[PDB]
Enzyme design. Structure first.
Site, PDB file in Angstrom:
ATOM      1  N   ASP G  39       2.184 -13.777  12.059  1.00  0.00           N
ATOM      2  CA  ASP G  39       1.045 -13.440  11.219  1.00  0.00           C
ATOM      3  C   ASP G  39       1.492 -13.444   9.759  1.00  0.00           C
ATOM      4  O   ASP G  39       2.618 -13.829   9.434  1.00  0.00           O
ATOM      5  CB  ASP G  39       0.457 -12.095  11.638  1.00  0.00           C
ATOM      6  CG  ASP G  39      -0.213 -12.152  12.996  1.00  0.00           C
ATOM      7  OD1 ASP G  39      -0.786 -13.209  13.334  1.00  0.00           O
ATOM      8  OD2 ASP G  39      -0.167 -11.139  13.725  1.00  0.00           O
TER       9      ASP G  39
HETATM   10  C1  LIG Z   1       7.701   3.883  -1.593  1.00  0.00           C
HETATM   11  C2  LIG Z   1       6.259   4.111  -1.148  1.00  0.00           C
HETATM   12  C3  LIG Z   1       5.753   2.878  -0.404  1.00  0.00           C
HETATM   13  C4  LIG Z   1       4.469   2.371  -1.059  1.00  0.00           C
HETATM   14  C5  LIG Z   1       3.363   2.251  -0.013  1.00  0.00           C
HETATM   15  C6  LIG Z   1       2.093   1.738  -0.687  1.00  0.00           C
HETATM   16  C7  LIG Z   1       1.463   0.656   0.188  1.00  0.00           C
HETATM   17  C8  LIG Z   1      -0.015   0.939   0.436  1.00  0.00           C
HETATM   18  C9  LIG Z   1      -0.339   0.728   1.914  1.00  0.00           C
HETATM   19  C10 LIG Z   1      -1.851   0.586   2.084  1.00  0.00           C
HETATM   20  C11 LIG Z   1      -2.241  -0.824   1.648  1.00  0.00           C
HETATM   21  C12 LIG Z   1      -3.212  -1.452   2.646  1.00  0.00           C
HETATM   22  O1  LIG Z   1      -3.502  -0.875   3.639  1.00  0.00           O
HETATM   23  S1  LIG Z   1      -3.888  -3.106   2.316  1.00  0.00           S
HETATM   24  C13 LIG Z   1      -4.835  -3.702   3.747  1.00  0.00           C
HETATM   25  C14 LIG Z   1      -6.233  -4.101   3.284  1.00  0.00           C
HETATM   26  N1  LIG Z   1      -7.067  -4.463   4.417  1.00  0.00           N
HETATM   27  C15 LIG Z   1      -7.561  -5.820   4.577  1.00  0.00           C
HETATM   28  O2  LIG Z   1      -7.292  -6.651   3.777  1.00  0.00           O
HETATM   29  C16 LIG Z   1      -8.449  -6.163   5.772  1.00  0.00           C
HETATM   30  C17 LIG Z   1      -8.592  -7.674   5.946  1.00  0.00           C
HETATM   31  N2  LIG Z   1      -7.426  -8.213   6.621  1.00  0.00           N
HETATM   32  C18 LIG Z   1      -6.942  -9.540   6.282  1.00  0.00           C
HETATM   33  O3  LIG Z   1      -7.516 -10.177   5.464  1.00  0.00           O
HETATM   34  C19 LIG Z   1      -5.718 -10.121   6.992  1.00  0.00           C
HETATM   35  O4  LIG Z   1      -5.663  -9.616   8.297  1.00  0.00           O
HETATM   36  C20 LIG Z   1      -4.416  -9.773   6.265  1.00  0.00           C
HETATM   37  C21 LIG Z   1      -4.214  -8.260   6.244  1.00  0.00           C
HETATM   38  C22 LIG Z   1      -4.444 -10.308   4.836  1.00  0.00           C
HETATM   39  C23 LIG Z   1      -3.244 -10.414   7.005  1.00  0.00           C
HETATM   40  O5  LIG Z   1      -3.570 -11.727   7.358  1.00  0.00           O
HETATM   41  P1  LIG Z   1      -3.040 -12.304   8.807  1.00  0.00           P
HETATM   42  O6  LIG Z   1      -4.113 -12.120   9.852  1.00  0.00           O
HETATM   43  O7  LIG Z   1      -2.715 -13.771   8.671  1.00  0.00           O
HETATM   44  O8  LIG Z   1      -1.800 -11.550   9.221  1.00  0.00           O
END
Ligand SMILES: CCCCCCCCCCCC(=O)SCCNC(=O)CCNC(=O)[C@H](O)C(C)(C)COP(=O)(O)O
Ligand SMILES: CCCCCCCCCCCCCCCCCC(=O)OC[C@H](COP(=O)([O-])OCC(O)COP(=O)([O-])OC[C@@H](COC(=O)CCCCCCCCCCCCCCCCC)OC(=O)CCCCCCCCCCCCCCCCC)OC(=O)CCCCCCCCCCCCCCCCC
Ligand SMILES: CCCCCCCCCCCCCCCCCC(=O)O[C@@H](COC(=O)CCCCCCCCCCCCCCC)COP(=O)(O)OCC[N+](C)(C)C
Ligand SMILES: CCCCCCCCCCCCCCCCCC(=O)O[C@@H](COC(=O)CCCCCCCCCCCCCCC)COP(=O)(O)OCC[N+](C)(C)C
Ligand SMILES: CCCCCCCCCCCCCCCCCC(=O)O[C@@H](COC(=O)CCCCCCCCCCCCCCC)COP(=O)(O)OCC[N+](C)(C)C
Ligand SMILES: CCCCCCCCCCCCCCCCCCCC(=O)O[C@H](COC(=O)CCCCCCCCCCCCCC)COP(=O)(O)OCCN
Ligand SMILES: CCCCCCCCCCCCCCCCCCCC(=O)O[C@H](COC(=O)CCCCCCCCCCCCCC)COP(=O)(O)OCCN
Lengths: 57, 44, 77, 83, 97, 127, 83, 111, 120, 536
Positions: G39
């Site tokens: 993925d």
């Molecule tokens: C040191 C501290 C660490 C810092 C942590 C900070 C990080 C923040 C974590 C929270 C961020 C999120 O959740 S950001 C997640 C946002 N949610 C979405 O985008 C839903 C739609 N999903 C898609 O478009 C695809 O599934 C995709 C995911 C692109 C993959 O593609 P593949 O299907 O090809 O794998």
């Protein structure tokens, strides 16, 4: 081949530095450094002053 | 478990030669303690 | 003649592209801010000046008060 | 201060100067610090083991002087009425 | 590129030089080149050591003439072996040695 | 390998230069830097000056609390349970001369007031 | 040091085996990540594992362009600092 | 494509007609840049973009005049202190209005 | 988030967020042992919202994660020494060839070397 | 005999840096260590003659170095007990660093110039320490400043190294300017520059402030500590010399040689620098940075102790001499670890088979820093902490600094050895020659001798303290060490970030002080000389 200026430069500057050395050291006291002349006189006045201050105390 | 198997890929870090040896950190501490114990007995 | 204006892209894969640029506008501090910081930092720099002014003022004021009292004591008596 | 009078000073000026004792160390224990100093410098590396009697004696005299200082403090405090 | 004729006069890369590292061999520096190791180094170092010992001798002579000790040492000092101006040692009590 | 490592060369200037371009230091290697780091551009840790000031505001009181008590709230009599070291008169008189000395705080002494005024000496030479 | 293609291939293949989903026989020197079953999040982890394997730092723009096994091997071979 | 111009033996001749470029002093000149040259020109000829604006007047007066005023005030204070220290009568300075004529202390006189 | 990150498409933005979060996990860790649980936690955090289709909620998640990744940027990034931002980057840079050396410089027109005053 | 040491170092400098083409890399690997060994023999003789046997000597090289009217100064060297002790420590550390550089700098193009700079650096330090007048001290102060500028910026193709050197130079200029002002005050009102006649019982506050401001530069105290952390760009041998002895110690030496300091200021500034340095070292992730912050903390302890009592000067010098050995050992071991692992980050270190000597030397130096009982560092640090009890403010801050020191030191020891391997699976190696083993033997010998011989005469004199108050430094150190091994979190992310940014002193300077400096320059030039007063 040596440069045109090498002989003239070495002679003129070496002569300057050697003359400065000879004047600084060779010359009699008080000719170049005025303080050197005053040193014996200061010793005599120091002796007089020391005796006088002792008497004053 | 989803994801890269980070720990299986890096399983070489437990190599016998990559572990902690007390002798390296403290080369002669045992000798020093044995000498102190002998001196203790003599002095006492 | 002049040097080439063409960059070298040999190491672009290894060390990253040069596309990203600086965000600075290359302009200096505002005039209002500068006036405050000059008139704040410079007095800090001249700390001896203020110490001398303080002591001198204290000395002169004491001397003047002494003279005033002397005058008062020398008038009646 | 008056109630707890200073002890007699065994060390004289000539002895303290001869032993090169700084002024700060001339505090009624200078004779003992002279003994300790002479022994410590005499044994440059072995003083910690060898020169232990002199250190003990200095520390004891210093303790007595410290007790005197605390007593003086308490007496002054009582005179001022704080305690 | 065909190395220029003078390149024959210049020295090769030393043993300590990393094989990948390229430096211009024509540049002269008084402190030496990039990795040095010249031929005849052993003789140069022997000459250097001799000049060091001769200058140490001169410095020792000068210092001994100018070293003024105005207070007696507490005990015997090594300077007595070489310098005659050391005041006779006096101990902490005051006894002369 | 310490020597001979690859480096990226900074691209040649290709646009009109800003008037204050002297604020940028570029030796020809790709990552050029400001004259003083943090003057402009990316800030280390994404922390602004305001954040640092707020931190110092939180920290300063806690750090200053030990010092303010003894220096200001406390007094010579109450600072310590003992008096300063007692010395013979000849030694004590000389030691009292030093402005940066430790014998000037002896309240028990009858010369306390003079010694205290000596300690709080002149700010600058009168002559 | 210019690392040869054969070594780079064997080590990239070695790294790719670690994903649980991937079948040990599908990974070939010229295979897209999609066919392998990775993925988007998996691709990031694989690129990072490549970063650990060859001890290099991949700029993010290039890392985005890595999506097949072939281009990764090519990129590592091109890099002169790959170990 | 290049040749050594310099001859240590002293038999130096400029081969102005040589096909190959002489390695003369011009070999080591650094290549200029069209943009750097224009920056240099702009920096030197910065009087053209000077404009009298209230901000410019403010900045000039506050830093240049302000420093000059501070410096004069400090020097006047130091002169006053020295006169008090030395015991000399208040000296007649240029802008000071003093009903005294004292300027240079008499070496013979004891102050 | 910077402009370059913002211009990127959604897929590349989330890949970048995962990459940066993993690097920041590495920077804030005290050893490799800490990294593995934290990296698994980050993976689970992204996997949890991967199937979301509501554009508005996705935007909220992305923006929040970007603010978190901006605040938690490390003062000291863990960068390999030989790469930009590394201690040994540029220590002794490899010299390029084609260096212009002028041989026997003082012997080129030795007598007439100097500055001339040309007049009209 | 006394002059010989300075002669040997200056000769080694001239030889390596002017005649290196003849001597070669190997020639510098001989002449450097040989000269330093001879200087060690001379320094040992000086130490025995002056310190142990109380025989101060004055050597006047020449008179009338400066002879303008009344102002007269001469080039003279007085070897007093402070000078002998510092000479010995400096030469011992320099001899070790010269032995270390033989293998460390083999991969560097100018090993001859490096050795030359190291020997000139040591010579100027000995000139500063042994000077009999304030002008000779200034000559040494500037010489070490210039040698540091030439050594921190050794890697010229790195913008960070050149900026670090500029930073050092500017900070040291501000400090030596305050020193010059204080020396002028002291000459004017005492009549001489010699320390014998310099003695003044009561000094106006201005001179005290100027002296302190001058000292806080070299001995990086608060507001003037920015250059020390940056000075990590230079090669590891430079860092060992500057941090352990040559640079940080000079400020303390100046304060102890002329006791013009004010008790109120030195105590607060010191305790603050100790705490801040420890907090900064907690956040740091570079091995070499943590040891620099540790240096800052220890300097804070030495500055703070001067306020506590009359023996504070002796206690400070004793800590200074004890600190130079272990701190030098910590830097040399850190350098070897970096060289062997090709890594500067604590995260990627771990347990790996190595040399017993290096691991032991690192453990013992860390233990000395930590305060492990019956060690040279312990006695020199307890002498400070126990005597600081009278000043309630200084004591509390210094105990907190002891805790933070223990925590980071234990964390570093765990990360470098106890922790599992953290670097990559790549071929890395640095083989150690017998010269490095001799260098560590010398450092360990210094550490051992310090325990037997001691640091101050009043080291073991009784401090009349309750048992609970006397033994508290140990409990605080143990608690910090245990908390550091567990790698626990002590502060919130907001404070950890604040401490990583070192308090934002440099961000303040860049945003406000540098902008004001370049706005003053813009008004002075663009607006005025080349604007208002320039013709069309
Ligand atoms: C040191 C501290 C660490 C810092 C942590 C900070 C990080 C923040 C974590 C929270 C961020 C999120 O959740 S950001 C997640 C946002 N949610 C979405 O985008 C839903 C739609 N999903 C898609 O478009 C695809 O599934 C995709 C995911 C692109 C993959 O593609 P593949 O299907 O090809 O794998
Ligand atoms: C300090 C505070 C801050 C300083 C300034 C802040 C505001 C300044 C306000 C003044 C101002 O705006 O001036 C601009 C103005 C120039 O106009 P412009 O807008 O720049 O452009 C017009 C030109 O075409 C411009 O064309 P151009 O570009 O070709 O010409 C440029 C020219 C233009 O320059 C000039 O024309 C005047 C140059 C010097 C002005 C003299 C003092 C002006 C300000 C001083 C006090 C300001 C306090 C407010 O500059 C020069 O090249 C000449 C300078 C070279 C000589 C350097 C000598 C310097 C002397 C003093 C320096 C100024 C003080 C600052 C530094 C402090 C150091 C002590 O200058 C003046 O007019 C001079 C004002 C006062 C002159 C002195 C009095 C004259 C006496 C006449 C008496 C009449 C006699 C009657 C008989 C007549 C029959 C014969
Ligand atoms: C491309 C260069 C390659 C070659 C390098 C050359 C190497 C030069 C060596 C450095 C010289 C160091 C010597 C410094 C002392 C200067 C010598 C000197 O001035 O002679 C003095 C005699 O004094 C001496 O000989 C000093 C002894 C020199 C060696 C002693 C120890 C050597 C260690 C160096 C430390 C010196 C510290 C001095 C700092 C000021 C002259 O005596 P006077 O008659 O009193 O002269 C009047 C004084 N005045 C100059 C002010 C007008
Ligand atoms: C005081 C009594 C005795 C005095 C002896 C002083 C010690 C030796 C002094 C020798 C002459 C003094 C100044 C030499 C010229 C200054 C230039 C210099 O020192 O170094 C040159 C080059 O060095 C030389 O060729 C000559 C140096 C020979 C000896 C230098 C010893 C250190 C200088 C002492 C500092 C002078 C003190 C001045 C203020 C007190 C430049 O070096 P870098 O800028 O670092 O670049 C080199 C390339 N790289 C990037 C790879 C580092
Ligand atoms: C409040 C002041 C209290 C004490 C004052 C002492 C120091 C004040 C400011 C220190 C500036 C010195 C630092 C410096 O010279 O280094 C700069 C060089 O900067 C410059 O040259 C710019 C000029 C700054 C010098 C003066 C600016 C401040 C002036 C103070 C007040 C302004 C006017 C007041 C009176 C004139 C290099 O920047 P970095 O990036 O940090 O280098 C470190 C290495 N590393 C890359 C690894 C991070
Ligand atoms: C233990 C001994 C003490 C050691 C250090 C103590 C330092 C304590 C001083 C800081 C505490 C008071 C700060 C003043 C209150 C400000 C509160 C918010 C700050 C603020 O809003 O503006 C800031 C002003 O910078 C500022 O706040 C600069 C004011 C600082 C005064 C000068 C003191 C020297 C500071 C040196 C270290 C301090 C580092 C952090 C301040 C950032 O302004 P901006 O850049 O965002 O404006 C935009 C550019 N147009
Ligand atoms: C259009 C052109 C000009 C327009 C803009 C000008 C704005 C500038 C105005 C303020 C500038 C600085 C303030 C200095 C003058 C203040 C008032 C002058 C009157 C005066 O002499 O009072 C003295 C000021 O203190 C002093 O003696 C000086 C204190 C300030 C000096 C230190 C401040 C910065 C330090 C930076 C270095 C500069 C000096 C270096 C030596 C103290 O009164 P008194 O006891 O002397 O009695 C003397 C009888 N009035």
């Amino acid at each position: 081949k040596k440069l045109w200026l090498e002989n003239i430069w070495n002679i003129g500057y070496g002569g300057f530095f050697l003359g400065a050395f000879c004047l600084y050291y060779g010359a009699p006291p008080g000719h170049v450094i005025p303080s050197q002349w005053a040193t014996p006189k200061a010793k005599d006045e120091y002796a007089v002053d020391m005796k006088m201050i002792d008497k004053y105390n | 478990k989803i994801g890269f198997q980070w720990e299986k890929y890096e399983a070489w870090r437990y190599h016998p030669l990559l572990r902690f040896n007390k002798n390296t950190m403290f080369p002669g501490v045992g000798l020093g303690a044995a000498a102190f114990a002998v001196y203790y007995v003599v002095d006492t | 003649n002049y040097a080439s204006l063409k960059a070298d892209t040999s190491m672009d894969h290894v060390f990253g592209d040069s596309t990203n640029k600086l965000n600075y506008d290359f302009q200096l501090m505002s005039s209002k801010e500068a006036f405050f910081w000059n008139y704040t930092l410079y007095p800090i720099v001249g700390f001896p000046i203020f110490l001398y002014l303080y002591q001198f003022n204290k000395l002169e004021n004491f001397e003047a008060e002494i003279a005033a009292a002397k005058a008062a004591k020398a008038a009646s008596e | 201060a008056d109630r707890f009078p200073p002890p007699k000073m065994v060390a004289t000026q000539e002895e303290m100067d001869n032993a090169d004792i700084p002024y700060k160390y001339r505090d009624y224990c200078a004779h003992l610090i002279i003994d300790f100093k002479e022994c410590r410098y005499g044994h440059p590396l072995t003083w910690r083991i060898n020169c232990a009697h002199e250190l003990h004696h200095y520390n004891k005299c210093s303790y007595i002087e410290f007790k005197r200082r605390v007593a003086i403090a308490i007496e002054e405090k009582k005179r001022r009425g704080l305690m | 590129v065909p190395e220029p004729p003078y390149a024959k006069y210049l020295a090769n890369k030393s043993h300590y030089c990393p094989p990948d590292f390229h430096y211009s061999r024509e540049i002269y520096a008084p402190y030496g080149g990039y990795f040095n190791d010249p031929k005849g180094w052993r003789t140069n170092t022997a000459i250097a050591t001799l000049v060091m010992l001769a200058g140490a001798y001169a410095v020792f002579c000068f210092g001994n003439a100018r070293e003024e000790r105005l207070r007696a040492p507490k005990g015997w000092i090594p300077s007595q072996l070489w310098n005659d101006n050391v005041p006779t040692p006096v101990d902490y009590r005051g006894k002369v040695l | 390998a310490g020597a001979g490592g690859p480096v990226k060369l900074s691209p040649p200037v290709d646009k009109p230069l800003p008037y204050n371009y002297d604020f940028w230091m570029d030796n020809g290697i790709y990552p050029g830097q400001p004259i003083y780091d943090g003057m402009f551009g990316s800030m280390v840790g994404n922390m602004s000056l305001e954040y640092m000031a707020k931190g110092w505001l939180v920290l300063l009181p806690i750090l200053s609390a030990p010092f303010v008590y003894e220096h200001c709230i406390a007094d010579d009599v109450t600072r310590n349970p003992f008096v300063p070291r007692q010395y013979p008169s000849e030694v004590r008189e000389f030691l009292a001369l030093f402005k940066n000395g430790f014998v000037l705080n002896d309240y028990s002494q009858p010369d306390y007031e003079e010694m205290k005024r000596r300690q709080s000496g002149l700010l600058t030479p009168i002559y | 040091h210019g690392l040869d293609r054969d070594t780079v291939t064997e080590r990239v293949i070695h790294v790719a085996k670690h994903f649980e989903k991937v079948d040990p026989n599908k990974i070939t020197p010229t295979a897209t990540f999609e066919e392998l079953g990775l993925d988007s999040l998996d691709t990031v982890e694989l690129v990072m594992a490549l970063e650990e394997e060859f001890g290099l730092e991949i700029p993010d723009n290039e890392a985005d362009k890595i999506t097949t096994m072939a281009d990764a091997i090519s990129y590592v071979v091109s890099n002169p600092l790959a170990k | 494509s290049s040749r050594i111009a310099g001859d240590t033996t002293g038999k130096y001749t400029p081969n102005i007609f040589s096909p190959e470029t002489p390695m003369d002093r011009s070999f080591s000149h650094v290549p200029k840049n069209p943009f750097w040259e224009a920056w240099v020109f702009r920096r030197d000829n910065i009087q053209r973009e000077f404009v009298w604006t209230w901000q410019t007047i403010f900045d000039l007066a506050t830093f240049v005049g302000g420093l000059y005023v501070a410096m004069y005030a400090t020097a006047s204070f130091c002169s006053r202190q020295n006169d008090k220290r030395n015991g000399y009568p208040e000296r007649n300075y240029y802008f000071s209005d003093s009903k005294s004529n004292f300027v240079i202390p008499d070496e013979r006189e004891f102050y | 988030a910077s402009e370059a990150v913002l211009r990127l498409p959604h897929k590349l933005r989330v890949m970048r967020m995962y990459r940066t979060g993993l690097k920041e996990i590495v920077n804030w860790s005290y050893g490799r042992h800490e990294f593995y649980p934290r990296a698994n936690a980050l993976r689970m955090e992204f996997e949890a919202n991967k199937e979301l289709s509501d554009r508005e909620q996705i935007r909220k998640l992305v923006l929040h994660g970007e603010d978190l990744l901006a605040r938690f940027r490390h003062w000291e990034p863990t960068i390999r020494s030989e790469f930009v931002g590394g201690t040994v980057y540029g220590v002794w840079p490899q010299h390029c060839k084609d260096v212009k050396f002028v041989p026997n410089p003082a012997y080129i027109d030795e007598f007439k070397q100097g500055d001339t005053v040309l007049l009209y | 005999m006394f002059l010989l040491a300075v002669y040997f170092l200056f000769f080694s400098a001239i030889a390596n840096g002017f005649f290196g083409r003849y001597l070669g890399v190997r020639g510098s690997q001989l002449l450097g260590p040989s000269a330093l060994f001879l200087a060690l023999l001379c320094s040992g003789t000086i130490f025995y003659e002056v310190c142990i046997q109380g025989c101060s000597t004055n050597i006047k090289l020449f008179e009338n170095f400066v002879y303008s009217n009344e102002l007269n100064v001469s080039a003279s060297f007085l070897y007093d007990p402070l000078a002998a002790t510092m000479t010995l420590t400096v030469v011992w550390i320099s001899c070790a660093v010269h032995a270390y550089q033989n293998l460390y700098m083999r991969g560097d193009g100018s090993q001859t110039l490096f050795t030359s700079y190291l020997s000139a650096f040591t010579g100027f330090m000995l000139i500063l320490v042994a000077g009999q007048n304030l002008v000779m001290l200034f000559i040494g102060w500037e010489g070490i400043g210039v040698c540091s500028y030439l050594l921190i910026g050794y890697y010229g193709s790195r913008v960070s190294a050149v900026k670090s050197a500029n930073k050092s130079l500017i900070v040291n200029k501000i400090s030596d300017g305050f020193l010059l002002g204080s020396m002028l005050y002291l000459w004017f009102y005492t009549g001489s520059f010699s320390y014998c006649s310099l003695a003044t019982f009561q000094i106006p506050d201005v001179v005290s402030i100027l002296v302190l401001l001058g000292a806080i530069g070299k001995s990086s105290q608060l507001f003037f500590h920015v250059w020390l952390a940056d000075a990590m760009e230079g090669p590891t041998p430079v860092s060992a010399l500057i941090h352990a002895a040559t640079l940080v110690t000079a400020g303390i030496y100046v304060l102890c040689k002329l006791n013009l300091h004010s008790q109120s200021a030195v105590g607060i500034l010191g305790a603050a620098t100790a705490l801040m340095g420890g907090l900064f070292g907690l956040a740091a992730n570079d091995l070499k940075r943590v040891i620099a912050f540790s240096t800052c903390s220890q300097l804070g302890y030495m500055m703070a102790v001067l306020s506590t009592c009359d023996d504070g000067a002796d206690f400070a010098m004793g800590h200074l001499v004890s600190h130079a050995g272990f701190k030098a050992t910590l830097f040399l071991s850190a350098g070897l670890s970096i060289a062997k692992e090709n890594n500067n980050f604590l995260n990627r270190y771990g347990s790996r088979q190595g040399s017993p000597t290096l691991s032991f030397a690192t453990t013992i130096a860390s233990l000395n820093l930590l305060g492990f009982p019956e060690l040279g560092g312990f006695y020199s640090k307890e002498s400070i902490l126990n005597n600081a009890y009278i000043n309630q403010g200084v004591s509390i801050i210094l105990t907190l600094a002891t805790f933070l020191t223990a925590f980071y030191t234990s964390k570093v020891l765990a990360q470098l050895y106890l922790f599992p391997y953290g670097n990559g699976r790549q071929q890395k190696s640095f083989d150690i020659d017998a010269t490095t083993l001799i260098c560590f033997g010398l450092l360990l010998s210094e550490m051992l001798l310090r325990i037997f011989t001691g640091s101050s005469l009043s080291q073991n004199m009784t401090t009349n303290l309750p048992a609970h108050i006397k033994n508290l430094p140990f409990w605080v150190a143990l608690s910090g060490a245990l908390s550091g091994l567990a790698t626990t979190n002590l502060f919130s992310s907001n404070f950890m970030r604040f401490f990583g940014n070192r308090g934002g002193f440099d961000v303040f300077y860049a945003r406000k002080c540098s902008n004001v400096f370049y706005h003053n320059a813009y008004v002075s030039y663009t607006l005025l000389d080349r604007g208002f007063l320039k013709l069309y």
